[PDB]
Amino acid sequence: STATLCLGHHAVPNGTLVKTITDDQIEVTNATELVQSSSTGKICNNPHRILDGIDCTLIDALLGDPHCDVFQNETWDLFVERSKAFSNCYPYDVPDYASLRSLVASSGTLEFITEGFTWTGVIQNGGSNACKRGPGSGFFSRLNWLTKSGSTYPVLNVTMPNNDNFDKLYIWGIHHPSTNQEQTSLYVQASGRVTVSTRRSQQTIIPNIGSRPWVRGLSSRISIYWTIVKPGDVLVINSNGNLIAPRGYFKMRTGKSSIMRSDAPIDTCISECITPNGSIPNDKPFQNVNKITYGACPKYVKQNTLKLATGMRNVPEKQT
Amino acid sequence: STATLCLGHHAVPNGTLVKTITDDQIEVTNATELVQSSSTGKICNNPHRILDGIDCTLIDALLGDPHCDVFQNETWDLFVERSKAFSNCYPYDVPDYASLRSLVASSGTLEFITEGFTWTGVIQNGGSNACKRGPGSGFFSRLNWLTKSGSTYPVLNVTMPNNDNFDKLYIWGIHHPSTNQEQTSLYVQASGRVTVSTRRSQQTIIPNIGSRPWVRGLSSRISIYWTIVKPGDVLVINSNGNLIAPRGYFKMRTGKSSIMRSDAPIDTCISECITPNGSIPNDKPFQNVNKITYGACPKYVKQNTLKLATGMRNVPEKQT
Amino acid sequence: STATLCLGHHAVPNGTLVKTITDDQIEVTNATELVQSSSTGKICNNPHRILDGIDCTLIDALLGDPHCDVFQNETWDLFVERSKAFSNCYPYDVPDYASLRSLVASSGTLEFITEGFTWTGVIQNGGSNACKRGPGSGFFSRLNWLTKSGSTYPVLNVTMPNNDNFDKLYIWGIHHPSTNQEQTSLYVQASGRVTVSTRRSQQTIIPNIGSRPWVRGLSSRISIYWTIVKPGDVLVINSNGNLIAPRGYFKMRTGKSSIMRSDAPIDTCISECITPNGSIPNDKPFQNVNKITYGACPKYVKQNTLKLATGMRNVPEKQT
Amino acid sequence: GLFGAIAGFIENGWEGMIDGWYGFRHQNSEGTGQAADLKSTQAAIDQINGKLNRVIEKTNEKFHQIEKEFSEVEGRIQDLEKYVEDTKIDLWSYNAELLVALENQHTIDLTDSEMNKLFEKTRRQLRENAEEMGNGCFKIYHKCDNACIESIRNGTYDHDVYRDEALNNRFQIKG
Amino acid sequence: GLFGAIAGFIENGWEGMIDGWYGFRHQNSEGTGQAADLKSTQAAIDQINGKLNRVIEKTNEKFHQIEKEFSEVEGRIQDLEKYVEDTKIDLWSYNAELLVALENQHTIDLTDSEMNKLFEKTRRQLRENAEEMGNGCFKIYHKCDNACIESIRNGTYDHDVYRDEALNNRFQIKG
Amino acid sequence: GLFGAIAGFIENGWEGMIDGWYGFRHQNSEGTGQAADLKSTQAAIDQINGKLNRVIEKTNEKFHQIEKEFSEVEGRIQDLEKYVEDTKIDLWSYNAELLVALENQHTIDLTDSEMNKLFEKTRRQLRENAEEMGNGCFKIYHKCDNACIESIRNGTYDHDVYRDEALNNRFQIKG
Numbered sequence A, B, C: 001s002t003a004t005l006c007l008g009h010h011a012v013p014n015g016t017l018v019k020t021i022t023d024d025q026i027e028v029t030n031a032t033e034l035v036q037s038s039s040t041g042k043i044c045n046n047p048h049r050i051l052d053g054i055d056c057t058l059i060d061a062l063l064g065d066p067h068c069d070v071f072q073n074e075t076w077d078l079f080v081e082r083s084k085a086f087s088n089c090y091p092y093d094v095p096d097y098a099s100l101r102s103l104v105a106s107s108g109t110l111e112f113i114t115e116g117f118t119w120t121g122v123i124q125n126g127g128s129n130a131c132k133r134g135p136g137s138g139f140f141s142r143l144n145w146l147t148k149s150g151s152t153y154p155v156l157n158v159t160m161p162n163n164d165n166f167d168k169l170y171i172w173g174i175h176h177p178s179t180n181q182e183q184t185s186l187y188v189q190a191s192g193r194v195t196v197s198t199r200r201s202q203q204t205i206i207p208n209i210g211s212r213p214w215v216r217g218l219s220s221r222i223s224i225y226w227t228i229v230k231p232g233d234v235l236v237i238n239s240n241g242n243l244i245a246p247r248g249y250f251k252m253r254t255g256k257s258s259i260m261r262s263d264a265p266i267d268t269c270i271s272e273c274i275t276p277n278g279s280i281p282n283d284k285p286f287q288n289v290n291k292i293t294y295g296a297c298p299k300y301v302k303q304n305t306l307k308l309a310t311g312m313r314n315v316p317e318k319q320t
Numbered sequence D, E, F: 001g002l003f004g005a006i007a008g009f010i011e012n013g014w015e016g017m018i019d020g021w022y023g024f025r026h027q028n029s030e031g032t033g034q035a036a037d038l039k040s041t042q043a044a045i046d047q048i049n050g051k052l053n054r055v056i057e058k059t060n061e062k063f064h065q066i067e068k069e070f071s072e073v074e075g076r077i078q079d080l081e082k083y084v085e086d087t088k089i090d091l092w093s094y095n096a097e098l099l100v101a102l103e104n105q106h107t108i109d110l111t112d113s114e115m116n117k118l119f120e121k122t123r124r125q126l127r128e129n130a131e132e133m134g135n136g137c138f139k140i141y142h143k144c145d146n147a148c149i150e151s152i153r154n155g156t157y158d159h160d161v162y163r164d165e166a167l168n169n170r171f172q173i174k175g
């Protein structure tokens, strides 16, 4: 004569705990993880053009350290610097190394165009046993070591116009002898100087004589500088000694290129997101793998887990 | 014998779609836009004191490039640099140009107080045909080009105390000749030097000889430096050559002044908010016009539209 | 035959106003303050190791200004610089003072290890009446002023290897004479030079002659530099004049140490959070005392009050 | 919404009702009619206005900042300058998006709530004199002319006056 | 709030009730009385406490940072240093403000909800033995002394025991 | 939750119900049974899906940024570089935490709301033919076999067909 109709909802034997506004842990039927916390341990060669530096830093590949000759004219989306990288050429320093490395990494190309510089009155192509190329002495491939021709080192004054529609990056340097004897032996002048300028910029460098610690048999050094010449501008190099001349320019580009420090293997696969730990999927909005990323990546958070409830409050049955 | 009373709510024939927590698009009766995405295209001269630089950069107006003489002693809330600006005086560079431009833009005044410097043993007021003032040669109005008086250029050693209750900004420079002949012709000494110091700071600059590219008929250059002297401190200038002396100081102020790059017309109107695109109203909390703003402005967001529901869910009628 | 049962809730004669999504002020039964806006005015010596600099800046205590001799070898979690601090030794400058101060403050120790440098052919331990130590002339305790031994100042070339498993910080400097007479009197050479290098870095400094303003009877100056030598690297010092030699190295550490500018008294108490205004409790999530903090501190916000409702809407009784 | 009134048990809205947001439509001895309820309308409106005033409040003034466009490539400092602004823009863009979503969800729930509170208030006035049809309408079991309807609308309805007529109609007529 | 109980159908609160947040006031054969309901009080309190503990939790430790006050004018690096901190302060100030507003809105709705859940729970216990007056009060159509009232309060009220007396009183007396 | 249905007047859930999230269990002349309500299930599911799609949407691409690990001690610029990233990480970590908390609170309230809307909808279909037991169950005062039950479930239940039987059973039998 009567009936009973009860309304209800489902429950699962084991739900998941989630945080809420009023609760640190409350059980729900289902939840989903929002923080990516694991990596494959390998870097996928797809879809970004990955360039393994192997035992070359981007700077050594740029200068032309003999063992980095293989990177001549390379391009990349992500240049990967290995910790095993080392230098094996003339001992040098780059005042403001981070900026040079940054702007080159960002440009994304090592394309070098040789230009016909004329260095009149000097002997070119100097080399060192600290930078052997094959059997004998060599030097960085993109630089030209000029020494005195006989009894005088003249006041070099050359120009190279940027008649193109793009920016030219010129890398050049100055030689710091370890003694005055070396200074006069190579450059005659007791004190050299290099002035590199465009119509808007100008840089004058004076060599610093002195003994530095021995590196590859040498106590002298080379300091690297750079000059970007915009279309229509002109490059002028003036010097009466110590000039480590450029052989041409690197083409500059703007794009998505960068550089990363990582010893992770490069594997054949596809992944939008790269961290030094290896690639990681980007299906989740956050990640806790590494704050250093490249590509379409989840945002870095300090948490290793953040569950989003995708079900109702779990209230299991009575029991009998 | 009975009646029917129905409760209800309104609806509109055409509502607006808005985003919610669970919905990307849901129709509501009314909504309001929170993102300002259009500009007038003109900069209102009210309420901020706008100063149009015309064809002068703030730095050229500060140095006194003859064509910027009109800005002498100007003040502003916002100095506006036009892309059409150009230099027409002695070729120069300001090592750390961004800082000089920044601190002057921020101070907000070009008020110059001439001080009675005595430059004994030198010929003052040198000029150049690269910096013509009217018919003949000129030079920056706020700088004093000193050259040798006869056979010697003495060791200049002057002092100027800050007996005021404010900070003095002194702009000075050094001349880089293009050849040694020019160096000795003007300064006698084969190598000049300028040391500018207060009790707390000190700066020594050595000129760099060398040919730079031709600008306004010249291959030599001037490099600009600055020194701020606090009340009670003293300015001392020491040099035996190449000094481009100051004629006095600029008064420094702290306030809301700034500088902006924009080619937008200045119109007579009133607007709290300025962007390089022109003024924009600030009735909305966010804007998508430009990340560069000045004044009471909506916050910059990447979105071009964000509608806030100002009505209920729109549920239109049946139809028959 | 019947009864009345009314449901209800409590009310208080005076509630607190709080902000909500739809209300700027709405009365609730209870609320709690989230913004810490007061300070004790004193800095608790617990739990962080507080070091009062008294009348010494961290740099003067590092160089060894005679009146800061008491800080030799000190360590701290927080070094506190008082505004009353002053210098009383040879007039000097530290090009990039902020970095030196920062890295030392951060290292957290003034532990100095004297090393057996040999300065052959020079007279050591020079002093000045500008830096009196007791009755007569002194100099910074951690620096060694070398002058010429007779008729010549030789080319100093010393080395000191880092055979330890930690980084060594070396502080050294260069002397800028006020005249050439002083230059030759002390160093013989008309122009000195100091080159300090490791295998990776190198620095060459040339003194700048010129009169600066008088400080403690002197118009000459000393400029301070630093070099960090990593384990296995070697320090080489080369100079033929103007060298203000190091006497050893400071041990470097990594940790929670820092430095703060404050004239607030140090009291015996316990407090995780320190601001220049004094310690503040950290029971509240936000604070409006100072944006400068050290330790476990509430986050700085611009608001001076933010009440969190901890009760229901307050609806007081009728009245009769 | 959370209450299931608007776009819930209430089929659709009424177009053309310009005197209010919520209202009544009746059918009685004298005919039909519609009227806006001003109290509930005002409550929803005040909450939306309060919500709107907090959001469109106090734009903060910034004057001299950092440069955000560069003509030359510089390296380190410029990378930092750009990262700082990009970081800032991303966080504010996130704030703007979340703000709008929360608010809108709330606005829809709040208006749905006011529809429900008006319905419940009306239910309570009628006591045993009416039954609920399940569509936002009540069947009032007694003769209720326009003045009667207006007394329900103005909240001065006295259920007692009609209780006996209603009860006989409700619990009888057939059984 | 969303439920319309507190500051809604319930006219005002009761000052002086110190034993709880929610309660009952009755008038019966034996007189009047008031009592706190501990279960609903505790529910609202636990939620507010849980909410408060998440907010006043874990201040993070920062040690060496960047300088935030400068004595000299420097230009570029200093502008950046200042912009960074100002940007940071604005974003946290925004976080603090929004947090408080959300929370407070929620606290008011949650307490309003608990008032309503207690009301509904009571309604369901009474079945056909009472009618709702529209002001948070029920008219219990049968003699209900203090023990009867306490049984409603403690949730052991058996509507059956009084159904026939209540029904006769409700649907009759006059008709 | 705000509605007090799930983990409220509804004691516990039903394990093993795989055909839906919400449903009915009945006991009639022909026996017992359980069935999922697809409409309410789908409503809760669509809202959770919509919520999930907004959150797991559009990861933004960043390419060249700033350095975040350093091998040498540098001072000023490095402190700034580190402060910037730490500041950024703290603000996003805060965003992630708050987001999850809000969302979860909302998800629980929304599902609790759908349980309630289904309950209310059912209540309204039954009219005077059933009474509410206070536990999510209705006592249907008339013979209701499986087809009758399914008509309630499919929303085609006509209360009129059973009104007189129900009323006699409800308001009588004893009195």
Ligand SMILES: *[C@@H]1O[C@H](CO)[C@@H](O[C@@H]2O[C@H](CO)[C@@H](O[C@@H]3O[C@H](CO)[C@@H](O)[C@H](O)[C@@H]3O)[C@H](O)[C@H]2NC(C)=O)[C@H](O)[C@H]1NC(C)=O
Binding pocket: A179, A211, A212, A213, A214, A219, C157, C158, C159, C234, C236
């Ligand atoms: C100035 O002082 C530096 C530092 O002490 C001197 O450098 C040292 O120079 C000698 C050669 O004169 C180096 O010796 C070489 O060592 C290598 C490696 O063991 C060995 O294979 C060679 O056959 C040679 O013996 C020594 O390594 C080097 N030490 C350092 C730390 O660099 C420098 O010679 C001095 N210069 C003058 C002009 O006095």
Ligand SMILES: *[C@@H]1O[C@H](CO)[C@@H](O[C@@H]2O[C@H](CO)[C@@H](O[C@@H]3O[C@H](CO)[C@@H](O)[C@H](O)[C@@H]3O)[C@H](O)[C@H]2NC(C)=O)[C@H](O)[C@H]1NC(C)=O
Binding pocket: A157, A158, A159, A234, A236, B179, B211, B212, B213, B214, B219
């Ligand atoms: C060092 O090399 C530079 C760069 O080549 C030389 O600069 C050039 O100098 C000549 C004058 O000697 C400039 O000629 C002038 O050109 C202008 C513009 O067309 C014309 O109106 C003048 O009548 C004159 O002919 C030439 O423009 C300039 N080139 C550049 C790129 O700056 C410099 O002369 C050399 N210095 C020495 C001491 O050899």
Ligand SMILES: *[C@@H]1O[C@H](CO)[C@@H](O[C@@H]2O[C@H](CO)[C@@H](O[C@@H]3O[C@H](CO)[C@@H](O)[C@H](O)[C@@H]3O)[C@H](O)[C@H]2NC(C)=O)[C@H](O)[C@H]1NC(C)=O
Binding pocket: B157, B158, B159, B234, B236, C179, C211, C212, C213, C214, C219
């Ligand atoms: C180059 O110019 C500077 C700046 O004018 C000269 O400095 C001044 O030098 C004199 C000493 O020759 C200082 O006098 C001393 O003053 C103190 C303090 O009153 C007093 O106690 C001493 O007995 C002495 O008289 C004077 O203070 C100082 N002025 C400044 C601003 O530093 C410097 O002498 C000049 N150098 C040359 C080589 O001409």
Ligand SMILES: *[C@@H]1O[C@H](CO)[C@@H](O)[C@H](O)[C@H]1NC(C)=O
Binding pocket: A072, A073, A111, A112, A113, A114
């Ligand atoms: C590098 O690329 C440029 C552009 O094609 C070309 O001029 C040059 O010959 C190339 N050199 C090498 C070594 O590949």
Ligand SMILES: *[C@@H]1O[C@H](CO)[C@@H](O)[C@H](O)[C@H]1NC(C)=O
Binding pocket: A037, A038, A039, A276, A277, A288, A289, A290
């Ligand atoms: C990623 O690498 C960092 C350091 O490079 C390490 O601390 C962290 O644990 C790694 N995380 C994972 C998931 O591998």
Ligand SMILES: *[C@@H]1O[C@H](CO)[C@@H](O)[C@H](O)[C@H]1NC(C)=O
Binding pocket: B072, B073, B111, B112, B113, B114
């Ligand atoms: C600039 O203003 C100052 C201060 O009034 C004054 O000394 C000077 O004469 C003014 N010069 C010009 C060119 O207006």
Ligand SMILES: *[C@@H]1O[C@H](CO)[C@@H](O)[C@H](O)[C@H]1NC(C)=O
Binding pocket: B037, B038, B039, B276, B277, B288, B289, B290
């Ligand atoms: C504002 O200017 C920027 C570049 O200056 C441009 O990309 C943008 O489209 C402009 N926006 C508007 C609304 O004019």
Ligand SMILES: *[C@@H]1O[C@H](CO)[C@@H](O)[C@H](O)[C@H]1NC(C)=O
Binding pocket: C072, C073, C111, C112, C113, C114
């Ligand atoms: C400083 O501490 C070091 C390490 O213990 C020790 O070599 C030296 O003797 C101490 N010097 C002073 C002045 O305490």
Ligand SMILES: *[C@@H]1O[C@H](CO)[C@@H](O)[C@H](O)[C@H]1NC(C)=O
Binding pocket: C037, C038, C039, C276, C277, C288, C289, C290
């Ligand atoms: C803290 O100090 C700052 C300046 O050092 C001052 O402006 C502020 O008012 C002080 N606040 C308190 C609470 O003392």
Ligand SMILES: *[C@@H]1O[C@H](CO)[C@@H](O)[C@H](O)[C@H]1NC(C)=O
Binding pocket: D146, D147, D148, D150, D151, D154, D156
């Ligand atoms: C309510 O309606 C009745 C009947 O139409 C009218 O007489 C009365 O004045 C109204 N009450 C109010 C408060 O407006």
Ligand SMILES: *[C@@H]1O[C@H](CO)[C@@H](O)[C@H](O)[C@H]1NC(C)=O
Binding pocket: E146, E147, E148, E150, E151, E154, E156
């Ligand atoms: C409820 O009230 C009755 C009557 O006052 C009392 O006898 C009974 O013990 C109470 N039940 C509980 C569980 O407290």
Ligand SMILES: *[C@@H]1O[C@H](CO)[C@@H](O)[C@H](O)[C@H]1NC(C)=O
Binding pocket: F146, F147, F148, F150, F151, F154, F156
């Ligand atoms: C509802 O149930 C009845 C009885 O079981 C059935 O005949 C009818 O077809 C169903 N209606 C719908 C719309 O499914």
